[PDB]
């Protein structure tokens, strides 16, 4: 079984890349696809706690693979299943790790992102 | 001579935060230091802000009533739209691409600006 | 003599009928383009060999943005006017945004940080 | 308010009781040092961690000259005052002249090109 | 309103600058500039000097500074004494720019040159 | 027989390095010593003709291992005209154009280092 | 405070939404009117008592031209807009061109010399 | 440009207020503070010329004060006055008159001028 | 009364437009062949106030306090009687400031009222 | 620092103005100014024009304006076109200052004159 | 050329080695003298016919304070230096303070309002 | 026979007024009509010699009642007989005459010039 790319974070059977570059959520998805990855899908609280403790630049928000659409009236992951118990407000919003919590923000806002690769 | 933690650029005195907050708190913080959320009046002021803000998405003194309303400074004077603001939100911040916008409750670093005066 | 002139505004450089602005710090293509537009300018356009020589020289050894972009690697190089580039000096690399380097003109990503050049007519 | 003041002269940045000049283009150690002296300044000196953090932050991604020199690889680092360096941040390389980089402080020969930072008390 | 500088000249604030493509001695260089209603480069501020140092690239270039002898003061082509902000290197009578700042050489030595004049009519 | 360094000029049994950096003749000597070389000693007119044709930046002057300390090479035998075209005081020699010229040793000039094989 | 403003150009005085200009030497009506027009202004117009009070106070003891004229002694007083004067402050004399004096408003021929006052909206 | 408030006069980058009635130094200083201003300060010859010209024939308080006759004259900033135009009289509070600048008691009544930067 | 002076009872008044020290005020009245104002009654005061027009300025009168006497004296030179100088006493001179007689510093610049 | 204007010249900011003692035709006036390393007066700001109008007293004085014909635009001696801030009266080719502002007359008309040059080194 | 210079400070007029300031409004002798002194100057002094001609010509039709004064009608006219006037141009009137008028030089009391000329060496 | 007005020049049976005010020849005619006079008609060389010796301000040009019209191709007085060489030294087009120096000169009628009005007594 193959190992994580040269300068990516390794946890369980997942590879993470934290961008230094910021853009819209749509443009974030495009950068992960160009990298042969997907936006971050948080499997558990352990994975979240790891990422936060390995970020260092905790003072910036990061897009994740979670968005709210009017068509479904629900929060859906990009994999693409509905979210189960995001501290904020729901309209035409996308999720992002802002501080030590998952926050709902406008999808047009410029934010960095976390790409993930599955092993 | 500007106060401690503040940087002096020409006749202005600037404060670059170390910890992030929302647009309401940021505005309140600057006002307490007899300042306001950063306003750039020329290219030199904007260049300084963009250069020194480093990799910190930081709030500036630009707000909107709605996406269909014009951008205004904290003076309530309308923005000259020289550098158009990205996003369809009500509160602006500086990033590496220029100026972007988010909701009132999002956390970002801030920038306070005041005149070096007496 | 009884009148003095300036040819270009403050911080800009004059070469014949054009005015040039050389950045002080690096930025990505998007901010750089936005900066020039605000000054009623565009990212640096070299019409002739003299204009290109000056840019290459005054920029020191700083990889600097110029106003040449292409939609994709298979698309033609265009100026910010959307007028196609005469391809006199072919651009190196297989990327969408041009920039001056010590070898001539090369290509990078919208997000790469580079010093920039703004240009406008006097 | 009834009067306005400035922290430092034009093109300089004020950080508490100090003023700093960040060059717009690179040069060798000799010209840099001569440039600072002409402005009644010296190649940048940092006295605390806050001053060093400012320099590292505002120098952007430019390898930039500071006021640290040594007689040889076997000699101690000294400031332009000729006061010895406290060696808090050890200097990389086996050369006589210090410059700031993204990793901290490194060294090269008198003749290499780099940006510079001047410093003087307000 | 502005006024574009002439062909082969660079414009910097209220001045106009000519950087030679060929070398000569100080006497020819000074004569060349005078014929264009100019003088060998004069810098009055740090901005003007930064320009000259940056654009001169790697071309050691003549500027309008001379001495009568090693024991005499440096004078501009106006015959106004040098403010000595940037002390000139060497013990020779004719100044020029280099990567180290301003140095000096003999009359007969060949170097490129810089003319400078006010943008005026 | 050993070969010339990676980015040096090769001719006969000599290695040449032409500097892009300029300083006093004393400082030129110091740079050659740091490089484990010496300032240029022109053995014949063939060596000179080669260097000139391999310079490219012919519009600059280059220090050589000849100085008025009369005129002596740094090896250090007295000079024979068989010609330094300029004026003598407290002078050092330099290749200015297609001729050896006497200049002030305090002047900033580039230089040519040489390594013998 | 964090920005500075001006209200009026240099040598002008700001009173509410207007910018008045008080001359330094006297001239005739023709030159005075030409001078104001060149600054995208007109000879002074007062619309309220406050504007007139300011003019009378700052004009000091200088008989100063304003923006009132009439075709003949039997014709009505008009502004430079050609809008008729409300005759609130009656003009003294039987001449065609108005000016402010210590008594209020008086009149003389086109050719007489007086200080002047320009007004334009900010 | 930005017009000065109502009842104020704009002169370059400053906004001036000339009172309509007289009062003691303390109420005048308090009145100016209420308008985010201070008793009038002149920084150049032009500012002083304006004040002298528009002051008309009203003796008017200005920002200069003194701790005692043996103490130096200071602005409301507490910055000492360059004494370009020396103040006449042996009192602690300065006012503008036709002869230049004079001094009187905290309790005497004068007209006043405020000053603030257009900001 | 002279051509441009105020007339009341058997007195002539001149209100100056020019301001100076109390000493210099006395000198101007003497040059005019007059003296500084001596208020005889409340009627005279009420008249002057109603005939001043420029009520927003202070005017020197012929009343001063000297340490030698430790009393307020008129320049005629009778000690003052309350029939009221509202202020503070040191090395002071009296002046009409508003609708009241006030004690001010004699070095202050003020206009004055001469009487014949 | 401050550099004094020559004798009979008046210094206003960075300029030196000369007011003639006698009248002449436009051609001699222009030739006189050239002899003093100057040109027929040019005003660049309201302050310069105010000075000229004030000190010209009651003397109709030649300035540096010309035009090829009534249908041609007004140009300075530089050949730079005039900004037309104060429009010139009359239908003639050569301008002079009067009490009404600026009027125009023929090349052979006798007017007083004003020169002007920069207080430059 | 090379650089441009000023003969005098802003708002001052240069006549040979002297600088002269002309007021924009009238004031008494005391303020006029105080004003000039604050600018390291005095109420105008003319040393030759050329200086006097300039003053008379540029003062326009404004009666203006110059730096001549006398102790009394029976005392000699002195400059602010306390050097006696050469009496080339006799002063009209029997007063202590001199001013320029359209006829030449006249005199009035300290308190009268007039314009004022300052002078100082360049 | 009635006498010349209060401040007019008297010669033979003619009254002269020399203006200090300048305008076009058309506007000069208008000022004379308002004064109940006409522009100057020179009867002889004696009248001219008198006027020149009574002008004083010899450095100015003065309009006279003589103009050239294409309709007649001749110089005509305003009275209005044709002019006779008994000499207008200048150029003829759509011109008006003026006393410039000690000679009658032909000038453009749009030029600003002073004028001489005349009243006949007879
Ligand atoms: C989508 O991802 C979430 C974790 O982010 C996970 O709980 C869910 O099972 C995933 N869906 C599928 C179809 O694997
Ligand atoms: C010194 O060098 C010169 C050539 O540069 C040569 O002619 C001479 O023989 C050398 N001297 C010795 C001792 O080898
Ligand atoms: C002095 O004047 C006051 C009124 O001002 C008066 O009461 C007093 O009697 C006068 N004294 C003399 C001696 O007349
Ligand atoms: C017109 O005037 C001229 C003198 O200017 C005179 O000679 C001529 O006779 C006059 N004509 C008439 C009709 O009087």
Of D43, D5, D40, D15, give the one whose Cα is nearest residue D27.
D43
Please identify which residue in the block is written with the tokens 């952007």: D60
**Residue-wise burial string across K43-55, b where 16 or more C-beta atoms lie within 10 A, e elsewhere:** bbbbeeeebbebb
In the block, residue with structure tokens 């003829």: L92
> What is the phi/psi pair of residue B11, to 5°?
-90, 5
For residue A57, the Cα-to-chain-centroid distance in whole angstroms is: 15
**CA distances, D6 to each of G2, K87, L85 (Å):** 13, 52, 78
Q: Residues J23, J104: contact at Cβ < 8 Å?
A: no
**Rounded Cα gap, residues A85 and G103, in angstroms:** 85
- The Å distance, Cα B98 to ligand 1 centre, comes to 35
- Distance of CA E46 to CAs C66, D120, E89, Å? 28, 16, 18
Interior/surface letters G13-48, b for 16+ CB within 10 angstroms, e for the rest: bbbbebbbbbbbbbbbbbbbbbbbbbbebbbbbbee
Q: Given an 8 Å threshold on Cβ–Cβ distance, is J59 in contact with L90?
A: no
Kindly give the pairing relationship between strand H8-11 and strand G13-15: antiparallel
Cβ-Cβ contacts under 8 Å for K44 (sequence gap 6 or more): K20, K55, K64, K65, K66, K67, K116, K117, K118, K119
**Chains D, A in contact, 3 or more Cβ pairs below 8 Å:** no
Task: Identify whether the C-beta of residue H14 lies closer than 8 Å to the C-beta of residue H118.
Answer: yes
Could you tell me whether strands I111-115 and I59-66 are parallel, antiparallel, or unpaired per DSSP bridges? parallel
- Looking at ligand 2, which residue's alpha carbon is closest to its atom 9? F77
User: Which residues of G have a CB under 8 Å from any CB of H?
Assistant: 1-8, 10, 13-17, 54, 57-58, 60, 122
- L65 close to L71: Cβ distance less than 8 angstroms: no
Strands C115-121 and C64-69, how do they pair?
parallel
Q: Under a CB-based contact definition with an 8 Å cutoff, are residues H119 and B117 in contact?
A: no
Angle at H50 (CA atoms; ends G114, G50), nearest 5 degrees: 70
Residue appearing with tokens 């003796």: H59
Q: Among all chains, which residue has been given the structure tokens 């109390």?
A: I22
Break positions in chain J: residue before each gap, C to N over 2.5 angstroms: none
Q: Answer whether J2 sits within 8 Å of K1, measured CB to CB.
A: no
With 0-12 / 13-18 / 19 or more C-beta atoms within 10 angstroms meaning exposed / middle / buried, residue E10 is buried
Q: Report all structural domains of chain E as residue ranges with CATH numbers, in order of start.
A: 1-121 (3.10.100.10)
Do residues K99 and K64 make contact, with C-beta atoms less than 8 angstroms apart? yes
* Tokens read off for D12: 């300089």
Phi, psi of I8 (to 5 degrees): -155, 130
Hey, which chains touch E, using 3+ CB pairs under 8 Å?
A: C, D, F, J, K
Output the CA–CA distances (angstroms, integers) from residue A33 to A9, A115, G47, in the order listed. Answer: 18, 9, 68
User: Cα(H97)–Cα(H91) distance, rounded to whole angstroms?
Assistant: 15
The residue behind tokens 């300068």 is A7
What SS3 state is found at L34?
Answer: helix
Instruction: State the Cα–Cα distance between residues G28 and G38, nearest whole angstrom.
Output: 16
What letters, b where the CB count within 10 A reaches 16 and e where it falls short, cover I90-112? eebbbbbbeeebbbbbbbbbbbb
Helix, coil or strand: residue L42: coil
DSSP 3-state of E52: helix
Breaks in chain I, after residue numbers (C to N greater than 2.5 Å)? 83
CB K102 within 8 A of CB K67: no
Compute the Cα dihedral for H64, H66, H69, H72 and give only its sign: negative
Q: Cα H91–H97–H102 angle (5° rounding)? A: 15
Maximum Cα–Cα distance across chain C: 56
Longest dimension (CA), chain E: 47
What counts of helices (H) and strands (E) characterise chain B? 2, 7
- Number of C–D residue contacts, CB under 8 Å: 9
Please answer whether residues J19 and J5 qualify as being in contact, where contact means their C-beta atoms are separated by less than 8 angstroms.
no
Residue linked to tokens 């390594």: F115
Give dist(CA L68, CA L93) in Å, integer: 7
Q: Which residues contact B53 (CB under 8 A, 6 or more apart)?
A: B16, B94, B109, B111
Q: Which residues contact L107 (CB under 8 A, 6 or more apart)?
A: J105, J106, J109, L61, L90, L95, L96, L97, L98, L100, L113
Say how far apart CA D114 and CA D108 lie, in whole Å. Answer: 10
- Using CB distances shorter than 6 Å, the residues near ligand 4 are L 41-43, 77, 79, 81
E56-85: buried (b, 16+ CB within 10 Å) or exposed (e) per residue?
Answer: beebbbbbbbbbeeeeeebebbeeeebeeb
Closest of K121, K36, K46 to residue K91, by C-alpha: K46
The β-bridge partners of J18 are J9, J115
For E82, which DSSP code?
A: P
Q: Counting runs of H as helices and runs of E as strands, what totals does chain I give? A: 2, 8
CA distance G51 to G61: 17
> Which residue from G7, G54, G58 is facing H53, i.e. has the nearest CB?
G58
Tokens at residue D37, please?
A: 């002296």
**Tokens representing residue F82 in the block:** 């068989």
**What does the longest C-alpha to C-alpha distance in chain K come to?**
57
Among K24, K28, K30, the residue with its CB nearest the CB of H49 is: K24
- Phi, psi dihedral angles at E30 (to 5 degrees): -60, -40
Q: Ligand 4: which atom is nearest the Cα of residue L43?
A: 4
The CATH number of the domain covering residues in F1-117: 3.10.100.10
The tally of CA atoms less than 13 A away on the side-chain side of residue A43 is 11
**Do B and H share at least 3 CB pairs under 8 Å?**
yes
DSSP string computed for J15-58: EEEEE-SS-B-HHHHHHHHHHTT-EE----SHHHHHHHHHHTTT
Residue L66 is encoded by which pair of tokens? 């003589």
Select the residue of E7, E10, E120 nearest C1 (Cβ to Cβ).
Answer: E120
End-to-end CA distance of chain C: give it in Å, rounded. Answer: 22
Q: What is the dihedral of CA I29, I35, I36, I42, to 10 degrees?
A: -140
CA I98 to chain centre: 13
Q: Is the peptide bond before F76 cis (omega within 30 degrees of 0)?
A: yes
Query: Whole-angstrom Cα distance, residue L40 to residue L62?
Result: 9
CA I88 to the chain's CA centroid = 17
- Chain C CB contacts of E54 under 8 Å are 58, 60
I39 lines ligand 3 (CB under 6 A): yes
- Ligand at minimal distance from the CA of L65 is 4
Burial class (CB in 10 A: 0-12, 13-18, 19+), K35: buried
- G49 token code pair: 């008592």
Beta bridge partner(s), residue F112? F18
**Contact by Cβ (8 Å): E61, E18:** no
Residue G31 · residue J100 · CB < 8 Å: yes
Cα separation, L16 vs L48, in Å, equals: 12
Residues A113 and A20: beta-carbon distance below 8 Å: no
Burial F3-25 (b: 16+ CB within 10 A, else e): ebeeebbeeeebbbbbbebbbbb
ω into residue C105 within 30 of 0, thus cis? no
Q: Do D1 and H76 touch (CB under 8 A)?
A: no
Cβ–Cβ under 8 Å, residues B108 and B59: yes
Cis amide linkage into residue C66, ω under 30° from 0 = no
Closest CA in chain D for residue B11: D6
For this PDB entry, the determination method is: X-ray
Q: Between β-strands K42-43 and K115-121, what pairing exists: parallel, antiparallel or unpaired?
A: antiparallel
Would you say the CB of residue I114 lies under 6 angstroms from ligand 3?
A: no
Residue L9 corresponds to which tokens in the numbers above?
Answer: 């020049």
Residues preceding chain discontinuities in chain F with C to N over 2.5 Å: 69, 82
Cβ contact J59:J24 at 8 Å: no
Task: Identify the sign of the CA torsion H108, H112, H117, H118.
Answer: positive
The answer to whether residues J110 and J23 touch, using CB atoms and an 8 Å cutoff, is yes
Task: Read off φ and ψ for residue E109, nearest 5 degrees.
Answer: -60, 145
Question: How would you class L91 by CB atoms within 10 Å of its CB: exposed for 0-12, middle for 13-18, buried for 19 or more?
Answer: middle
Please enumerate, as own/partner, the contacts of F32-36 that have beta carbons within 8 Å and a separation of 24 or more: F32/F111, F32/F113, F32/F114, F35/F113, F35/F115, F36/F115
Degrees, nearest 5: CA angle H92-H95-H101: 95
I74 pocket-lining for ligand 3 (C-beta < 6 Å): yes
Task: Report whether B95 contacts B87 (CB < 8 A).
Answer: no
**Yes or no: is domain I1-116 CATH 1.10.3720.10?**
no
Q: Where are the beta strands (DSSP E) in K1-122?
A: 13-15, 18-22, 42-43, 64-69, 97-100, 105-108, 115-121
Which uninterrupted H or E stretch holds G19?
Answer: strand G18-22
Question: By C-alpha distance, which of A58, A103, A108 is closest to B101?
Answer: A108
Ligand 2 surroundings by CB, under 6 angstroms:
F 41-43, 73, 75, 77
Q: Cite the DSSP H helix spans in I1-116.
A: 22-31, 42-52
Helix axes E46-55, C49-58, angle to 10 degrees: 110
Q: How far is the CA of L120 from the centre of ligand 4 (A)?
A: 12
Residue B45 near chain A (CB below 8 Å): no
Could you please state the CATH topology (level 3) that the domain comprising A1-119 is classified under: Mannose-Binding Protein A; Chain A (3.10.100)
- Name the burial class of residue B78, with classes exposed (0-12), middle (13-18) and buried (19+) by CB atoms within 10 angstroms of its CB: exposed
From the list J43, J40, J38, the residue with the least C-alpha distance to J53 is J43
CA E11, E12, E13, E15: dihedral to nearest 10 degrees?
-70
Beta strands in D23-96 (DSSP E): 42-43, 64-69
Note the resolution in Å, 1 decimal. Answer: 2.9
Question: Quick check: helix, strand or coil at residue A97?
Answer: strand
CA–CA separation, H24 and H47 (whole Å): 24
Which residues of chain E does F87 touch, with a Cβ-Cβ cutoff of 8 Å?
Answer: 106, 108
CATH class of L1-122: alpha beta
Residue A78 and residue A43 in contact, taking contact as beta carbons nearer than 8 Å: no
Instruction: Decide: D122 and D12 in contact? Cβ < 8 Å.
Output: no
Helices (H) and strands (E) in chain F, counts: 2, 8
DSSP collapsed to 3 states, chain H: CCCCCCCEEEECCEEEEECCCCEEHHHHHHHHHHCCCEECCCCCHHHHHHHHHHCCCCCEEEEEECCCCCCCCECCCCCECCCCCCCECCCCEEEEECCEEEEECCCCEEEEEEEEECC
Relative to beta strand L114-120, strand L61-69 is: parallel
Q: Which residues contact F57 (CB under 8 A, 6 or more apart)?
A: none
Nearest residue to G13 (alpha-carbon basis) of H10, H14, H18, H16: H10
Residue L28, SS3 per DSSP: helix
Asked whether G43 and G79 are in contact (CB, 8 A), the reply is: no
CA dist., res. D76 & res. D54, Å (int)? 25
């Amino acid at each position: 079984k193959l190992e994580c790319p040269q300068d990516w974070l390794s946890h369980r059977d997942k590879c993470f890349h934290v961008s230094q570059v910021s853009n819209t959520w749509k443009e974030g998805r495009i950068d992960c696809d160009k990298k042969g990855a997907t936006l971050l899908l948080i499997q558990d609280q352990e994975e979240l706690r790891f990422l936060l403790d390995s970020i260092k630049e905790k003072y910036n928000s990061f897009w994740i693979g979670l968005s709210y659409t009017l068509t479904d009236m629900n929060w859906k992951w990009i994999n693409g299943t509905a979210f189960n118990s995001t501290g904020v407000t729901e309209n035409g919003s996308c999720a992002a790790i802002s501080g030590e919590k998952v926050t709902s923000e406008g999808c047009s806002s410029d934010n960095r992102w976390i790409c993930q690769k599955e092993l | 001579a500007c106060p401690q933690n503040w940087i002096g650029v020409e006749n202005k005195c600037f404060y670059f935060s170390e910890y992030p907050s929302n647009w309401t708190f940021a505005q309140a913080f600057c006002m307490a230091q007899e300042a306001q959320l950063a306003r750039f009046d020329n290219q030199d002021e904007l260049n300084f802000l963009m250069r020194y803000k480093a990799n910190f998405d930081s709030w500036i003194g630009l707000h909107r009533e709605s996406s269909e309303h014009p951008w205004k400074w904290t003076d309530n004077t309308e923005y000259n739209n020289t550098i158009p603001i990205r996003g369809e939100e009500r509160f602006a911040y500086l990033n590496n691409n220029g100026i972007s916008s988010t909701r009132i409750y999002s956390l970002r670093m801030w920038i306070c600006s005041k005149l070096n005066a007496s």
